[PDB]
Amino acid sequence: MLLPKRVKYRRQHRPKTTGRSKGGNYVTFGEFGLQATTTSWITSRQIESARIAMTRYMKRGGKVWIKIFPHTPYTKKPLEVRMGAGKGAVEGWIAVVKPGRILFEVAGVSEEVAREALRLASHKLPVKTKFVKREEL
Amino acid sequence: KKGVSSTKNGRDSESKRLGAKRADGQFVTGGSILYRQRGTKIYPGENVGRGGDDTLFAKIDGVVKFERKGRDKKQVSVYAVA
Amino acid sequence: AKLQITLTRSVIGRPETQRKTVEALGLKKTNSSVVVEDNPAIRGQINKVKHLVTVEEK
RNA sequence: UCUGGUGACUAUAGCAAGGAGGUCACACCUGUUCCCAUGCCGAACACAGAAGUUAAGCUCCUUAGCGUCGAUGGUAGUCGAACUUACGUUCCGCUAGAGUAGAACGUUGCCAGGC
RNA sequence: CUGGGGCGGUCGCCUCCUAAAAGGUAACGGAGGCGCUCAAAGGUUCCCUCAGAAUGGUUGGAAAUCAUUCAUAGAGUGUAAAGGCAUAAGGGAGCUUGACUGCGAGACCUACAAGUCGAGCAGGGUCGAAAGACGGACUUAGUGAUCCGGUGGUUCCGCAUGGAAGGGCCAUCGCUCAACGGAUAAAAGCUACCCCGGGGAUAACAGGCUUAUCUCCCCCAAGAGUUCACAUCGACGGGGAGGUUUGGCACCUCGAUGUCGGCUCAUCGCAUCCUGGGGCUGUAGUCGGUCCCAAGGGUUGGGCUGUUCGCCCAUUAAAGCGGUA
RNA sequence: AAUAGCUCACUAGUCGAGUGACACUGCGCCGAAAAUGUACCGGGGCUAAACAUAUUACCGAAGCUGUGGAUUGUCCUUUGGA
RNA sequence: UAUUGGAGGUAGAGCACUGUUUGGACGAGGGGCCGGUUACCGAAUUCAGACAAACUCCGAAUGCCAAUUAAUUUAACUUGGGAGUCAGAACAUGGGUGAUAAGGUCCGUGUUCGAAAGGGAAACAGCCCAGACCACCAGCUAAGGUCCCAAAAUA
RNA sequence: ACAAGUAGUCAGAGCCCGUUAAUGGGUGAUGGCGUGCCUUUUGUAGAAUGAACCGGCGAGUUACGAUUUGAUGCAAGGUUAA
Ligand SMILES: [Mg+2]
Ligand SMILES: [Mg+2]
Ligand SMILES: [Mg+2]
Numbered sequence A: 001m002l003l004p005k006r007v008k009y010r011r012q013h014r015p016k017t018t019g020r021s022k023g024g025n026y027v028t029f030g031e032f033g034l035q036a037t038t039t040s041w042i043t044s045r046q047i048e049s050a051r052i053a054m055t056r057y058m059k060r061g062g063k064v065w066i067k068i069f070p071h072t073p074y075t076k077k078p079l080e081v082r083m084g085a086g087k088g089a090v091e092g093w094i095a096v097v098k099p100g101r102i103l104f105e106v107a108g109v110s111e112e113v114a115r116e117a118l119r120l121a122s123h124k125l126p127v128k129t130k131f132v133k134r135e136e137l
Numbered sequence B: 001k002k003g004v005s006s007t008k009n010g011r012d013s014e015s016k017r018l019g020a021k022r023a024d025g026q027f028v029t030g031g032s033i034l035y036r037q038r039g040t041k042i043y044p045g046e047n048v049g050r051g052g053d054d055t056l057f058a059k060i061d062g063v064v065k066f067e068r069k070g071r072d073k074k075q076v077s078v079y080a081v082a
Numbered sequence C: 001a002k003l004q005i006t007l008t009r010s011v012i013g014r015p016e017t018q019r020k021t022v023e024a025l026g027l028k029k030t031n032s033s034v035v036v037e038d039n040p041a042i043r044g045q046i047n048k049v050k051h052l053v054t055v056e057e058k
Numbered sequence D: 001u002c003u004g005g006u007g008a009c010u011a012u013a014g015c016a017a018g019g020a021g022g023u024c025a026c027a028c029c030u031g032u033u034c035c036c037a038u039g040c041c042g043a044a045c046a047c048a049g050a051a052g053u054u055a056a057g058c059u060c061c062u063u064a065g066c067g068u069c070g071a072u073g074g075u076a077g078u079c080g081a082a083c084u085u086a087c088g089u090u091c092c093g094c095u096a097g098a099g100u101a102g103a104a105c106g107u108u109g110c111c112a113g114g115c
Numbered sequence E: 001c002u003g004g005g006g007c008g009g010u011c012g013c014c015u016c017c018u019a020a021a022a023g024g025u026a027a028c029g030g031a032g033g034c035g036c037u038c039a040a041a042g043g044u045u046c047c048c049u050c051a052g053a054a055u056g057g058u059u060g061g062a063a064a065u066c067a068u069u070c071a072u073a074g075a076g077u078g079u080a081a082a083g084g085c086a087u088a089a090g091g092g093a094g095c096u097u098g099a100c101u102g103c104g105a106g107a108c109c110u111a112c113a114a115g116u117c118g119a120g121c122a123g124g125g126u127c128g129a130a131a132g133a134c135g136g137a138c139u140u141a142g143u144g145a146u147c148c149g150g151u152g153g154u155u156c157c158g159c160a161u162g163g164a165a166g167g168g169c170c171a172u173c174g175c176u177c178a179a180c181g182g183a184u185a186a187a188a189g190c191u192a193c194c195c196c197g198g199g200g201a202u203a204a205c206a207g208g209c210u211u212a213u214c215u216c217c218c219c220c221a222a223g224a225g226u227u228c229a230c231a232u233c234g235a236c237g238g239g240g241a242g243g244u245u246u247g248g249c250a251c252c253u254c255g256a257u258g259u260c261g262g263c264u265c266a267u268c269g270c271a272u273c274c275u276g277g278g279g280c281u282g283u284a285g286u287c288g289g290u291c292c293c294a295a296g297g298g299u300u301g302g303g304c305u306g307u308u309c310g311c312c313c314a315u316u317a318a319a320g321c322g323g324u325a
Numbered sequence F: 001a002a003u004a005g006c007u008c009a010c011u012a013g014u015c016g017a018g019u020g021a022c023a024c025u026g027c028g029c030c031g032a033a034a035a036u037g038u039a040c041c042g043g044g045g046c047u048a049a050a051c052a053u054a055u056u057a058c059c060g061a062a063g064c065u066g067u068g069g070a071u072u073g074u075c076c077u078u079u080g081g082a
Numbered sequence G: 001u002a003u004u005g006g007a008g009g010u011a012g013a014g015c016a017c018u019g020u021u022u023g024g025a026c027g028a029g030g031g032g033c034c035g036g037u038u039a040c041c042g043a044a045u046u047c048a049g050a051c052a053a054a055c056u057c058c059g060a061a062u063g064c065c066a067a068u069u070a071a072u073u074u075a076a077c078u079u080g081g082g083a084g085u086c087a088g089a090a091c092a093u094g095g096g097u098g099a100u101a102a103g104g105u106c107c108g109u110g111u112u113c114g115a116a117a118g119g120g121a122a123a124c125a126g127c128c129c130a131g132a133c134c135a136c137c138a139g140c141u142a143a144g145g146u147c148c149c150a151a152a153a154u155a
Numbered sequence H: 001a002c003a004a005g006u007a008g009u010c011a012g013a014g015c016c017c018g019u020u021a022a023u024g025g026g027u028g029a030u031g032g033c034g035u036g037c038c039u040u041u042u043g044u045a046g047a048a049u050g051a052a053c054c055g056g057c058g059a060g061u062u063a064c065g066a067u068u069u070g071a072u073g074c075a076a077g078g079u080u081a082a
């Protein structure tokens, strides 16, 4: 869950960060889930930090599903350059999120362990989150 | 002003004022272009012709009416009563 | 039947659309007024610029 | 409404399946001598003929598997307004896409023989 | 042209996106092409339908060709891209030259010059049995006014007349102007010896905004540290404050705002170097480390460099960090 | 350094009423350090003189009315009023 | 403006195409070996998920073009004489660029300032309200307000 | 002679005077409002430029020709130049 293997157009217009989650608002694979309540970017490197924390905290226990994939590339201009002269080069890959977009899913592990793991993941992550269970009823 | 950094994409053509040129209901004289296009976004219908440039022009005088052909194609017509 | 229109709010700072609508209703200056006959054509214009005018059943 | 032409409609018209039927119309069929016939077959195309047979194409009837169509309610979005500097809030029209109920195994014009 | 010049890049045309569902719309914004090619890859008449996939096989690099049911065109369309295309605009095949001459009601575009599309009407064709179709290539790039000069037609001009030399008109060619509306279609550099006219329309200094960089603070807590996240230190990540650095912007100042170090004189903040009060500790006290309260005062003399800085030699309780053009 | 283990698993009984958790919210708290002088309400000051939801007054402009006056335009002639 | 008729593919959605992607079925190719087995790995085929300026089976709001036509308004075009303008600015909103930086830069769409006095925002070209013909020691209000500075509720 | 001043305006007591007699002249305690003018600019109280102060002088004119408007002759004609 790091980078797209290939993209057609490598320099792209930045994403819209205003509105609500187009989809992925439900726990489908796992049992418990973690959704977001604000809307920032995710940079293919903070989710890496988060899945490590969760996985290593479960001690290779139950399964994990990352629901957010970093698709959008972003650019940064070289240091101390003036304005103009083209667009800069790719610095990282991102995936915008929206309030209500589930991010991580877990199953095959007790409820309290899952809540603790998703808590520890939440702090390595730049968006306010919430703990959710597989919606039923 | 920066320095040597340069881009390989600063080029474009002049847009061609295509699209519609008359609306349903107005009196067009014969020859009036109704819809400059490429390929066939709209086929000619009754009393309407196809130019070499896929342009659509009325054959005769009359009113203009856009209509449906089949499921996913549109034509144009001209009717003379005025 | 008959309704009376008064331009309570001003017209400064509003788009040319709302300026031309107010002109069409025949209202000249702030707090000017007119009496016209109830008519869906006129109601269309009042509704478009209701936030600048007010209506009465006179 | 049969039957065959012909053409009008957004596949509510189609595909698949099962089942009939050949009412003299329809295809199947016998052959290449005959015009013709094919970069390369009587395959087709054309042609002379009608002894075989509905088996298939065709026709009619079923069935929603399959195709298409598809509301109401809503939600997203947004025109105008009033707050406002919030990855905003409120009000008023308009109002999707997706999905769900459902429609649906066509309607139909002129002509010629039918009955 | 230029987020100041310079250096680099670019300059005309076509296609796409940015472009906010008519049209139009900018940046040294994001992607690519053109300066051609076709006597069939043109016209017309008649025919035909594709890529791939398996049920597969003489070859089988796999799939060459061949076979059979599905293949919505996933293929082809001379080329870039986008619109189109089974009416086929795709593929054959037969005739053929309309890749005609004279024109054009009408519209599109548009400052102009240009550019674009045209029903129809004559002449004379070619194809087709005829109806009809044909003034080039499925559409959109493949180019360059005007003066000058060359070649062929036509004289209708041609100085007192006849004829000619020269012109005119009609074809067409020929610069090559790519800085592609083309300053003569002849031409590069240094000025720290510079000068004049201008500009904060535009840079160097600081002032201002921003805070990428920069200094500091925090949050989570894998971990190291016998054991132990949390004496101390804290990875991966995440959130901030400040306006002291390197920058970005070009807003005041070019009818002048002296710019670096040092000297004299300071003044203010506290994220405190010493001194005062404390919590602690992996603190027995001296020791040190950490954090908190604290800005009252204090916070050296030299060697080396113009140096700020930094290193070094001696001390001190300490030899603090910054603002102040 | 073996360990020394009372108390909130647990309630009669000290005695007698209550007591874990959960959501979704309205308003605050901490995080919160900068340079001449308060100095991040304009000042005083405010526990409403803050905030929310209603309701009723009033102030507030060279806006708009009232009276008088220019100067042009369009109408009625009301050759005057509009 | 009300009512009809229409072109177009943005917001939003969606994955049917070009791609970009996360899990789970399911048989199988080079190949672990002797053509091989099994793991797999390159895909075929499915089920559930998602992402897109240069993706679209779909698809608004609004804008635009025009009408047999209405209703209210008062411009509009043609020709001629005379010009000035080619340094814009900030706010709000849709986008590019930058760093979802700038009182940045480049476009679109309003408004205002420019060329606009007056009231509010302490002061403060661009914000809010509102356009000053000239009196008046008259009256009503908009934005903002009503304990004092300082007109109005210690409602 | 307790005061914070782009020097005015507006409101006004007190004190002197009496005209181009008219709802009068001089000064002004105290209150309200209020950062010169030009140029140049997107924007200037500007710490952008210009002027110490007074006075005088100091910048779209004339000739010829073209065009257009008004005016006046008179009109299928009008008109002269040397
Ligand atoms: Mg000079
Ligand atoms: Mg000076
Ligand atoms: Mg001055």
Ligand SMILES: [Mg+2]
Residues within 6 Å of the ligand: none
């Ligand atoms: Mg001064």
Ligand SMILES: [Mg+2]
Residues within 6 Å of the ligand: none
């Ligand atoms: Mg001077």
